[PDB]
Amino acid sequence: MFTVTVPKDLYVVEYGSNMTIECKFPVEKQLDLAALIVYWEMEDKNIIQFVHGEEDLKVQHSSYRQRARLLKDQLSLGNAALQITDVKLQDAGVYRCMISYGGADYKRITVKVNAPYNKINQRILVVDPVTSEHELTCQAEGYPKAEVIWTSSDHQVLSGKTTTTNSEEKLFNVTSTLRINTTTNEIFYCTFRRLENHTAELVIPE
């Protein structure tokens, strides 16, 4: 019998990275491309229409002409791999692969797009060197909204101001400002807690 397998049914890819999702099917010896058909679909869009040797670029949807392709070299291994480049949030969802090869079967695959706050840009502004008054800043992009937790070197917790906007856009820009009098050699921490957490360390200079 002919069974399409998705040994990996859940993909968690990071925003902006490349994605390659796979469907396995039985190939007992030399693959015959003339008897092979491969469909890749998402929602109501056709991504790959690989029929009898060649991709039909006419049926395939316009949003994927340049982003998506089927790794042909893999097919001889009984592996139908769809590659999509620079993944966005609207690439998350359900994909269907249909393999026909002397028998037909299809499977579904879930793709999750993760946009974490793990690139934290920090700023240390000296407002008043007399009183050692500083204005610390932590900023990051990610989805969804997140809150920022400021902690001292004794992991005390302090209050700061936080602003959240939108931008790549439909992503969230989160920036927090902490005004505080310090002690050089002191270490502060900004922690981005998303709705786990990533923390940037801010060392006050001499």
Author numbering: 18 to 184, 187 to 214, 218 to 228
Task: Please give the exact wording used by the authors of the publication that reports this structure.
Blockade of PD-1/PD-L1 signaling pathway by monoclonal antibodies (MAbs) to release the anti-tumor activity of pre-existing tumor specific T cell immunity has initiated a new era for tumor immunotherapy. Durvalumab (MEDI4736) is a fully human IgG1 MAb targeting PD-L1 that was developed by AstraZeneca, and has been approved by US FDA very recently. In summary, we report the structural basis of durvalumab-based binding to PD-L1 and the molecular mechanisms of PD-1/PD-L1 blockade.
The complex structure of durvalumab-scFv/PD-L1 was determined by molecular replacement at a resolution of 2.3 Å. The binding of durvalumab to PD-L1 involves both of its heavy chain (VH) and light chain (VL). All of the three complementarity-determining regions (CDRs) of VH and CDR1 and CDR3 of VL contribute to interactions with PD-L1, leaving LCDR2 without any contacts. Here, the binding of durvalumab on PD-L1 was also mainly located on the front β-sheet face which is constituted by A, G, F, C, and C’ strands of the IgV domain of PD-L1. The A, G, and F strands of PD-L1 provide major hydrogen bond interactions with durvalumab. D26 of the A strand and R113 of the F strand of PD-L1 were occupied by S30 of LCDR1 and E58 of HCDR2, respectively. The binding surface of durvalumab and PD-1 on PD-L1 is highly overlapped that residues of PD-L1, which contributed major hydrogen bond interactions with PD-1 (D26, Y123, K124, and R125), were also occupied by durvalumab. Thus, the molecular basis of durvalumab-based PD-1/PD-L1 blockade is that the unbiased binding of durvalumab VH and VL to PD-L1 provides steric clash to abrogate the binding of PD-1/PD-L1. The blockade of avelumab and BMS-936559 to the interaction of PD-1/PD-L1 is mainly contributed by their VH domain while both VH and VL of durvalumab are involved in blockade of PD-1/PD-L1 interaction. On the other hand, the binding of VL does not overlap with that of the nanobody and small-molecule inhibitors. These results indicate that the binding sites of the VH domain of durvalumab may serve as hot spots for small inhibitory biologics development.
